[PDB]
């Protein structure tokens, strides 16, 4: 009905490989946290606020920043949020079950998951200093870029940090990305 090929880059994205999948209160907080301006509609300028914050925080290269933004890009344009139009709330949970069939539909073809590239993407921007992973004192600058409390890092660095290391691996941060999304 409402979202398909001509609307929807997940209907697209499953259109293309043969994959005819049709769609029959936390996940609009979700939404309602992401519509900056409570209008009802999530739209591009308003979800790459979230990098554009996140990269105030530390000193990332030009080239890491546009990855990031790029990976952003990309993944809220397949989450729904078109171009023009956005996403209206009518169509959030809708957007959100065709995108989880197209990141099921990417790993069967043995395709990048758009999480992972998310996830890969604020890993090289989170390792302010360089060593080669995210600690927790890093994990909370990302807190700090998503509006939430910087002491919840604790909790989520010790559910991702899964090999008790006290770094998170890139694999980690793509666990916790993924958790969070689906
Ligand atoms: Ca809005
Ligand atoms: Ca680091
Ligand atoms: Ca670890
Ligand atoms: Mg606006």
């Known amino acids: 009905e409402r979202l398909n090929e001509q609307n929807n880059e997940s209907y697209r994205y499953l259109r293309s490989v043969g994959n005819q999948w049709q769609f029959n ?3 609009y907080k979700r939404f309602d946290t992401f519509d900056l301006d409570s209008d009802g509609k999530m739209e591009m300028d ?3 606020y979230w990098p554009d914050r996140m990269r ?3 000193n ?3 080239e890491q920043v546009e990855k990031m933004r790029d990976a952003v890009r990309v993944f809220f344009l397949h989450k729904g949020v078109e171009p ?3 996403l209206l709330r009518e169509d959030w949970v809708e957007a959100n079950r065709v995108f989880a069939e197209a990141e099921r539909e990417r790993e069967r073809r043995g395709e990048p998951s758009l999480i992972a590239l998310l996830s890969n993407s604020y890993y090289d921007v989170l390792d302010d200093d360089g060593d080669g992973t995210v600690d927790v ?3 909370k600058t990302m807190m700090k870029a998503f509006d939430v ?3 919840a890092a604790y909790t989520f660095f010790e559910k991702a940090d899964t090999d008790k290391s006290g770094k998170l691996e890139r694999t ?3 666990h916790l990305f993924r958790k969070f999304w689906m």
């Open 25 to 27: 209160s936390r996940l």
């Open 46 to 48: 308003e979800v790459l």
């Open 56 to 58: 105030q925080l530390v």
């Open 60 to 62: 990332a290269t030009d």
């Open 84 to 86: 023009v139009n956005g």
């Open 137 to 139: 004192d890093e994990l």
């Open 149 to 151: 409390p910087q002491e």
């Open 172 to 174: 980690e941060l793509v």
